Design a protein around this ligand. Structure first.
Ligand SMILES: Cc1cn([C@H]2C[C@H](OP(=O)(O)O)[C@@H](CO)O2)c(=O)[nH]c1=O
Ligand SMILES: Cc1cn([C@H]2C[C@H](OP(=O)(O)O)[C@@H](CO)O2)c(=O)[nH]c1=O
Lengths: 233, 233
């Protein structure tokens, strides 16, 4: 079976990829976001949905996980979804300012505020993508993320979480946290993923060098043909 | 039918993508290289080949097209090919030095010299990827590329060309140039592509914003589901 990483292991793998393998953040953020959009189109293919094109709200956090969300949105649009983004805390770095411009010019709207009620989210968006916090989370959910998670936990439409469900302890999960319907584990699952009880758990980030996988015994499954996601079951 | 771009149009589209849409070179080079590796795995799936894993020589030029080649190689390895790279002229920029390290650490070998004879290439490599020059070419094929193209034109194994077959006039082609078996047109075909007479012509670079496609009337076809390549016929 695939390995489920401790937060320490995940941090080491991430730092190896950027330092020893000298991947750039742009590159792996592009592949991660693409895997997300791909996992989502396979779990919730546009023809299975009742709006045409189907609607999706992507909520982006203040760091890299939110970055992945921005990329996911752009790919989702190319895949025939109609995404909307909420991105309340944006770093002023070229990486993030670039991604914003790209999405803007793809006519993906950035909401001024979060719809305050779960019912209103449900009415407007057929799916919600949680791109708030990822494997590095140790918080301390500060505003506005506490208030956002509290809306999310009342939703009826499915949530897709990027890497980790935001607000979960990365290893121990969170019995009173959000309960997503899809979890896209990037590179390999974290220990919290044993607490997942949604329908769809995909592995994404098809970029792990074999030597890295072997050194960490990830026991990653074989991705089919040229697919960048694998459905774990 | 899809539009076939003049060199001027292609230059304008490229500059729009990097300036007005503010995509970064890393990002689109990653998607372009991924489309290449994907086109190649669909045209020459590993089970159709007689070596296991099948062998591929990727020849990288001195610019961005060679960049795409480097990325293509890395993805090809993940897709179950055994690539080898020849990369004689390497810019000393972090983009290219990064990509080299990545390939090195994936245990993809960089050849010290080109096999001097077509027969020796044919014996060692089941496929050859031409990543030498792309849409920006106006040369003036300087050494060592002249000598490389002269080996390539004597090969029996197929050549896959990235964007344009290296040594062709970007609009007018080249009756005495190389004759690849696969052409991966990136973003949209160039006018030289009307002179293509290999078996496989794929379109790649699934990243053209709809507004850009409309402004240039690319008439791009519909990519299927989440695929990043489309077979033109
Ligand atoms: C090891 C690991 C990496 N990643 C992401 C971080 C990087 O993308 P980004 O930084 O854009 O989220 C990439 C490689 O480390 O994959 C995870 O999301 N979770 C993990 O457990
Ligand atoms: C418009 C156009 C872009 N491209 C490439 C260049 C960029 O990738 P790269 O620079 O890594 O080759 C990307 C967007 O312009 O697609 C072509 O290869 N041919 C074209 O005709």
């Amino acid at each position: 079976a695939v390995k489920y990483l401790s937060q320490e292991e995940a941090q080491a793998v991430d730092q190896e990829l950027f330092n020893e393998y000298q991947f750039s953040v742009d590159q792996l953020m592009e592949l991660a976001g693409l895997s997300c959009a791909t996992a989502i189109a396979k779990a919730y293919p546009p023809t299975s949905m009742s709006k045409s094109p189907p609607t999706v709200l992507v909520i982006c956090g203040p760091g890299n996980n939110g970055g992945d969300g921005l990329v996911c949105a752009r790919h989702l649009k190319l895949f025939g979804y109609q995404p909307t983004i909420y991105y309340p805390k944006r770093p002023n770095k070229p990486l993030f300012t670039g991604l914003v411009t790209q999405c803007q010019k793809m006519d993906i709207p950035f909401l001024g505020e979060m719809p305050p009620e779960p019912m209103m989210v449900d009415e407007l968006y057929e799916l919600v993508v949680d791109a708030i916090f990822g494997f590095s989370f140790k918080g301390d959910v500060r505003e506005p993320f506490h208030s956002i998670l509290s809306v999310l936990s009342g939703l009826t439409v499915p949530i897709a979480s990027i890497d980790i469900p935001s607000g979960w302890d990365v290893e121990k999960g969170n019995p009173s946290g959000i309960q997503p319907d899809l979890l896209i584990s990037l590179t390999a699952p974290k220990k919290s993923a044993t607490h997942f009880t949604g329908r769809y758990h995909y592995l994404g980030g098809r970029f792990v060098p074999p030597a890295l996988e072997k050194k960490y015994q990830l026991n990653l499954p074989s991705y089919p043909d040229t697919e960048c996601v694998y459905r774990l079951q």
